[PDB]
Amino acid sequence: GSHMASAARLTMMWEEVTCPICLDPFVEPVSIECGHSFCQECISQVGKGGGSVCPVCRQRFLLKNLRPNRQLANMVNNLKEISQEAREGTQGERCAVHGERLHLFCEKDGKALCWVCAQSRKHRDHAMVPLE
Amino acid sequence: GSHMASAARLTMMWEEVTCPICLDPFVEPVSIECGHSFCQECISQVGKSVCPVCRQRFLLKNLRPNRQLANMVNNLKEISQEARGERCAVHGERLHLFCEKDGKALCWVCAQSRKHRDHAMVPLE
Ligand SMILES: [Zn+2]
Ligand SMILES: [Zn+2]
Ligand SMILES: [Zn+2]
Ligand SMILES: [Zn+2]
Ligand SMILES: [Zn+2]
Ligand SMILES: [Zn+2]
Ligand SMILES: [Zn+2]
Ligand SMILES: [Zn+2]
């Protein structure tokens, strides 16, 4: 049957589908030699000229050995959907990256945030205020 | 905040972390060249060739760890634990069914999975 997924549990699941370079949910997730995964755009940037080292474990990698890791993108989609299936007859703007409702504004980044955004490493030290 | 994961949604997430070879949740998940992933054991034994899902060629030296998949398994098992009896070893959910073909005790995820859903099952007593 169904189960309640706590806030803490959802945070951990998001963590697993989050790029270590940009700290957003993975977009076109790919893995390098060592098996660590990244957004394809992100690791392509780090490896400009053909290669570099893994930002997590410092093992060497080549851009030609990029591998698609589609299950991670599927898992992002499953997590975004939990937010839309949520609403007990309810509808409004949703975070482009998490699919949760937007109720906060990051003054540093000058954009709206959901609660997942607010707690994440990417924003949790920024100044935030409620939307109005 | 919190959200209800429906049974349908849970099922879908389980499907993503299930090995196409043994039809259980990944144990030591690893990828081959096409990007398809498998338990290390399961794909190793296919080598001892061609991708069971899509048929693209692969080589065993090119296996890569895909640890996110294992971490997700662990996350999904905790969901059941945090809503809390005897528990499925692969899914963490409560056992209430018994498979007459395999002779083992099943959780609701087992029962609806490709692996046992065609098997004769009965309630535990
Ligand atoms: Zn990224
Ligand atoms: Zn690495
Ligand atoms: Zn967000
Ligand atoms: Zn911010
Ligand atoms: Zn397997
Ligand atoms: Zn394949
Ligand atoms: Zn089970
Ligand atoms: Zn069975």
Residue numbers in the entry:
A (entry chain B): -2 to 129
B (entry chain A): -2 to 45, 49 to 84, 89 to 129
Give verbatim lines from the article.
TRIM21 is a member of a large family of ~100 proteins with a common ‘tripartite motif’ architecture, comprising N-terminal RING, B-Box and coiled-coil domains. Instead of recruiting Src and Syk kinases, TRIM21 stimulates immune signaling via the activity of its RING domain, which catalyses the synthesis of polyubiquitin chains. Here we show that initiating ubiquitination is a key step in regulating TRIM21 activity and that a novel mechanism of autoinhibition and kinase-induced E2 enzyme recruitment controls its potent pro-inflammatory activity.
Comparison to the TRIM5α RING:E2 complex shows that the B-Box is located where helix 1 of the E2 would normally be positioned during RING binding. Crucially, the B-Box is able to occupy the E2 binding site on the RING by acting as an E2 mimic, forming similar electrostatic interactions. The RING surface contains a negatively charged patch, which is complementary to a strongly positively charged patch on both the E2 and the B-Box. In particular, Box-RING interaction is stabilized through a salt bridge between residues R118 and E12, which is analogous to the interaction between E2 residue R14 and RING residue E11 in the TRIM5:Ube2N structure. Taken together, these data suggest that the B-Box may be an autoinhibitory domain whose function is to regulate RING activity by preventing E2 recruitment. Moreover, the target serine in this motif is located at the centre of the B-Box:RING interface and undergoes phosphorylation in cells. The {1H}15N NOE ratios reveal that the most dynamic region is the linker (residues 83–102) between the RING and B-Box.
